[PDB]
C-alpha cells in the first residue's frame, strides 16, 4: 500500500500551506501518523509523530493534525529552506508494518530571483597530458532553478559530447548546475576558443576560454 499525497504543493514565502495525507481506517484511521522531511543531499528527518507531537528540534510552525482517515501537515511562516519532499507514515495492522505516503514536493513561491555566476574552466594541463580534455562550465547562485546551456567551438554550435546536470540547491538556498564538454586534445588545440552560454530568465551569460591562454 501507499498513503495518498499530492505530488506537489506551492506556498508563498512567509505564509502557510497544508500537505494532505489520505489513507484508510487500517492505517491513518488508527491514530498515530508521523511525518518526515527529506532535503536532497541529506538523510530523512523525523518531523511529527503521534499525529501532533513535534520531534526534537522541530520548530513550532510545523504542526500535524488528523481527522479520521486524513492527516495534515501544516507549515506556517514558510522559509526557502522548507522546500523539500515530505512523507507521511502510519502503521497498518501492526506496529512493525509501516506504510509511507507517495510524497509531496513543497515549492516556496515569492523567493528573490538571482542571475547565475558562470565560470568556464579549460582542460587542465594534467588532463591534456593524459590525452583527454574536458571543458567544465560551473553555474551557481541563481534562482529560479532552471537554466539552458549551449556550447560553441569558435562560433559553431556544439551538440555532441555535452552533459549537463539538473540544477540543485546550494547551502545558501540558491541553485547551481554544471555542464561538461568532452573533447580530444587535438580538437581543443585546433579551435581558437570555446564558449559556454547560460540562459536564465530570458537573459544569457557567455564565458569563453582559449587554448592560447594559461
Amino acid at each position: 500500500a501507499v498513503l495518498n499525497q499530492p505530488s506537489s504543493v506551492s506556498g508563498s514565502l512567509g505564509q502557510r500551506v497544508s500537505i494532505t495525507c489520505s489513507g484508510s481506517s487500517s492505517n491513518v484511521g488508527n491514530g498515530y501518523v508521523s511525518w518526515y522531511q527529506l532535503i536532497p543531499g541529506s538523510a530523512p528527518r523525523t518531523l511529527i509523530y503521534g499525529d501532533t507531537s513535534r520531534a526534537s528540534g522541530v520548530p513550532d510552525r510545523f504542526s500535524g493534525s488528523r481527522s479520521g482517515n486524513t492527516a495534515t501537515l501544516t507549515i506556517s511562516s514558510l522559509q526557502a529552506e522548507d522546500e523539500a519532499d515530505y512523507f507521511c507514515a502510519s502503521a497498518e495492522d501492526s506496529s512493525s508494518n509501516a506504510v509511507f505516503g507517495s510524497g509531496t514536493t513543497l515549492t516556496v513561491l515569492g523567493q528573490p530571483k538571482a542571475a547565475p555566476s558562470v565560470t568556464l574552466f579549460p582542460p587542465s594541463s594534467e588532463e591534456l597530458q593524459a590525452n583527454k580534455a574536458t571543458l567544465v562550465c560551473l553555474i551557481s547562485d541563481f534562482y529560479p532553478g532552471a537554466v539552458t546551456v549551449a556550447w560553441k567551438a569558435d562560433s559553431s554550435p556544439v551538440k555532441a559530447g555535452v552533459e549537463t546536470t539538473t540544477p540543485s540547491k546550494q547551502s545558501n538556498n540558491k541553485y547551481a548546475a554544471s555542464s561538461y564538454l568532452s573533447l580530444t586534445p587535438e580538437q581543443w588545440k585546433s579551435h581558437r576558443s570555446y564558449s559556454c552560454q547560460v540562459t536564465h530568465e530570458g537573459s544569457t551569460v557567455e564565458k569563453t576560454v582559449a587554448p592560447t591562454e594559461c
Binding site: 491514530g31 506496529s95 512493525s96 508494518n97 506504510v99 551557481s140 546536470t165 540543485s168 547551481a176 568532452s182
Partner: protein, 265 residues
C-alpha cells in the same frame, strides 16, 4: 555527531543477495528497535523491516519473502538481507532506530473514562459520550498500533548492475587571471569516470566548508559518472593558502587528495 552506520556493497550484480549491516550501540541496541528503510530513485520511502532488543521481527508484507533480518547484540550489529535483487532494488538503504508498540486506544470521537473525567470502576473503558457518561455507549479499548522513525542513518547507496567498479581520476580546476570575481575566485576538482555512485568531496580535510558546492554527477554515454566540486576562496590567498580536495569513492575503496595549484596567469 553520533550516527548509525550502514555497511555493505555499493555494487551488486542482478539476482545476488544484498547483505547489509548496521552497527551502533550508543543508541542502545539493548533498549531501542532498529529498522530498515529504502528509497529508490524517483520513488517514495519504502519500509523493509525491523528487530528489537529481543529478536522480534516485523517485515514489509510485500517483500517479506526476500527479506531476512537478524542481529548480534554481542557485536551490536543488526543485519539485513535481500535476495534476488533487480535494477528496481537500486536505492539508498537507511538504518534507523524505530518506535514500535501496540497501545490501547478508543475509536475516533470516543475517550477513556478517566479522560472524560470519571473516576471509579469503568474508567479504563471507552465512552462515546463523556457528558452523560452513566448512559453513554461503552466499548472495551482496542489495539492502536504506533510507529515512527526515531533516528535516521546517513544511508548506503546500492547500485544493481552488471558493469564493473571503476575508481575516479581527479584533475584540478585551477583559478586564473581572467576567471576571478574581484575579491573572490572559484577553484575546484574534476572527479572523472567512476562507477558506481557515490563520490563525496571535502576540502582541506573538512577545515574548509565556507563556499563549497559539490555538484551532482553526470552519467556519460560511456556508462561512467563524473562530477565537480567547487569552492570560492579569497583571490588574495591564491599562492599562499594550499587548497586540497579530498575525494572519497567508497565503492572502489579509493581516496584521492589533489592539491589545486593556481595558474601562473
Amino acid at each position: 555527531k553520533v550516527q548509525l552506520r550502514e555497511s555493505g556493497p555499493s555494487l551488486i550484480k542482478p539476482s545476488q543477495t544484498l547483505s547489509l549491516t548496521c552497527t551502533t550501540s550508543i543508541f542502545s541496541l539493548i533498549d531501542k528497535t532498529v529498522g530498515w528503510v529504502r528509497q529508490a530513485p524517483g520513488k517514495s520511502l519504502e519500509w523493509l523491516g525491523s528487530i528489537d532488543t529481543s529478536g522480534n521481527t516485523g517485515y514489509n508484507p510485500g517483500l517479506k519473502s526476500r527479506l531476512h533480518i537478524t542481529k548480534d547484540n554481542s557485536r551490536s550489529q543488526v543485519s539485513l538481507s535481500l535476495s534476488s535483487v533487480t535494477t528496481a532494488d537500486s536505492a539508498t538503504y537507511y538504518c534507523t532506530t524505530v518506535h514500535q508498540q501496540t497501545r490501547k486506544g478508543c475509536p475516533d470521537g470516543w475517550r477513556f473514562g478517566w479522560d472524560c473525567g470519571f473516576h471509579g470502576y469503568g474508567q479504563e473503558d471507552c465512552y462515546e459520550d463523556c457528558i452523560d457518561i452513566l448512559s453513554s455507549q461503552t466499548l472495551s479499548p482496542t489495539d492502536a498500533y504506533e510507529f515512527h522513525v526515531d533516528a535516521w542513518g546517513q544511508g548506503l547507496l546500492v547500485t544493481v548492475s552488471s558493469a564493473s567498479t571503476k575508481g575516479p581520476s581527479v584533475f584540478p580546476l585551477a583559478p586564473s587571471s581572467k576567471s576571478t570575481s574581484g575579491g573572490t575566485a572559484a577553484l575546484g576538482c574534476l572527479v572523472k569516470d567512476y562507477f558506481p555512485e557515490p563520490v563525496t568531496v571535502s576540502w582541506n580535510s573538512g577545515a574548509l566548508t565556507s563556499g563549497v558546492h559539490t555538484f551532482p554527477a553526470v552519467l556519460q554515454s560511456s556508462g561512467l559518472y563524473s562530477l565537480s566540486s567547487v569552492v570560492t576562496v579569497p583571490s588574495s590567498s591564491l599562492g599562499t593558502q594550499t587548497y586540497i580536495c579530498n575525494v572519497n569513492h567508497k565503492p572502489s575503496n579509493t581516496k584521492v587528495d589533489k592539491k589545486v595549484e593556481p595558474k601562473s596567469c
